[PDB]
C-alpha cells in the first residue's frame, strides 16, 4: 500500500491534489547525484556532467531520495510526492561520492535553462561563493528557471551558496513540531522552510529510506512550485517564488524561518 510521508501531509499537498493539481506538464530538473530508476518514480530524461559517470543513475542515493519528495508517483506502492505528476529530469552534477565541482553545477544550470525546465532543485551547497556559480544562477533565472536551493546543515546563522544568492530561493528545514531543525542554516536571505527531519522517500535498490537535512526540505518547495505553475501556467519564476512566500504559514522571526512553512493548499487556492 502507499504511505503519505509526514512532510507531504504537513505542507498540505493532498489538498492541492484534491483540486486536480499534481504538477502535470511541469518540467523539474533535479541537480544532484543522479536519479535511479525506481518503481515509484517516472524519470523523463536528463544528462550527466560528471566525468567518469556517463549515466544519470544514482550511485549515492541522495538524488533519488530528493526526487521522490518532489514526485514519487500516486499509486498503490511506496510513497507520494508533493507533485506526483511533475516531469522529472535527472541532471547529474555530483558524483557517487556526493561531491562535484562548480563547473559541473554551472553546466547543469545552463542545461536546465536551455532545455525548458521551469524549476531546478539544488539540494547542495558550499560555504564559499563562486562567481561562476552566481552567473549560472542568474543566467538560469533570466531564462525562466526557478532555482530552489538548500540553506545548509551547519546550524549557523548565515546560509550556504548558492542559496545565499539573490536569484536562488533558499530553503531551511523544520522538524515534526514546526521548529527549526538544529542543523538548519538561517539568516539573511532565507526565504522559506519545509520539513527536513525523518523524511521518508525513494532510495536506490527499489527501496525507501528516512533521511534528515536541508536537502530534504528543498524538494518540498520545488514540488510546491510545480503545483503553482500547473495552476498558473503564465506565471514567471519570480511570481511563483513570491506567491509561495506570501501564502506560507508564519512561524515567527523571518530570520529563523523566512516567510514560514510552505503551504501547498494556500498557494493553490
Amino acid at each position: 500500500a502507499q504511505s503519505v510521508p509526514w512532510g507531504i501531509s504537513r505542507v498540505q499537498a493532498p489538498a492541492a491534489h484534491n483540486r486536480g493539481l499534481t504538477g502535470s506538464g511541469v518540467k523539474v530538473a533535479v541537480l544532484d547525484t543522479g536519479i535511479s530508476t525506481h518503481p515509484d518514480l517516472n524519470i523523463r530524461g536528463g544528462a550527466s556532467f560528471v566525468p567518469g559517470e556517463p549515466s544519470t543513475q544514482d550511485g549515492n542515493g541522495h538524488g533519488t531520495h530528493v526526487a521522490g519528495t518532489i514526485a514519487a508517483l500516486n499509486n498503490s506502492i511506496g510513497v507520494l510526492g508533493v507533485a506526483p505528476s511533475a516531469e522529472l529530469y535527472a541532471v547529474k552534477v555530483l558524483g557517487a561520492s556526493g561531491s562535484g565541482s562548480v563547473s559541473s553545477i554551472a553546466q547543469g544550470l545552463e542545461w536546465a535553462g536551455n532545455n525548458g525546465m521551469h524549476v531546478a532543485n539544488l539540494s547542495l551547497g558550499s560555504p564559499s561563493p563562486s562567481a561562476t556559480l552566481e552567473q549560472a544562477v542568474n543566467s538560469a533565472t533570466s531564462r525562466g528557471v526557478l532555482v530552489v536551493a538548500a540553506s545548509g546543515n551547519s546550524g549557523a546563522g548565515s546560509i550556504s551558496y548558492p542559496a545565499r544568492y539573490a536569484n536562488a530561493m533558499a530553503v531551511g528545514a523544520t522538524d515534526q513540531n514546526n521548529n527549526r531543525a538544529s542543523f538548519s542554516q538561517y539568516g539573511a536571505g532565507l526565504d522559506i522552510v519545509a520539513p527536513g527531519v525523518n523524511v521518508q522517500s525513494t532510495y536506490p535498490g527499489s527501496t525507501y529510506a528516512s533521511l534528515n537535512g536541508t536537502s530534504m526540505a528543498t524538494p518540498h518547495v520545488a514540488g510546491a512550485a510545480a503545483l503553482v505553475k500547473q495552476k498558473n501556467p503564465s506565471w514567471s519564476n519570480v511570481q511563483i517564488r513570491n506567491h509561495l512566500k506570501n501564502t506560507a504559514t508564519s512561524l515567527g522571526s523571518t530570520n529563523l524561518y523566512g516567510s514560514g512553512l510552505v503551504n501547498a493548499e494556500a498557494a493553490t487556492r
Binding site: 541522495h62 556526493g98 558550499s126 564559499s128 563562486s130 536537502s215
Partner: peptide
C-alpha cells in the same frame, strides 16, 4: 565545502 553530502568548492 559542504552541507552533509554536497560540497563544491571549499
Amino acid at each position: 565545502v559542504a552541507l552533509x553530502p554536497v560540497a563544491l568548492x571549499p
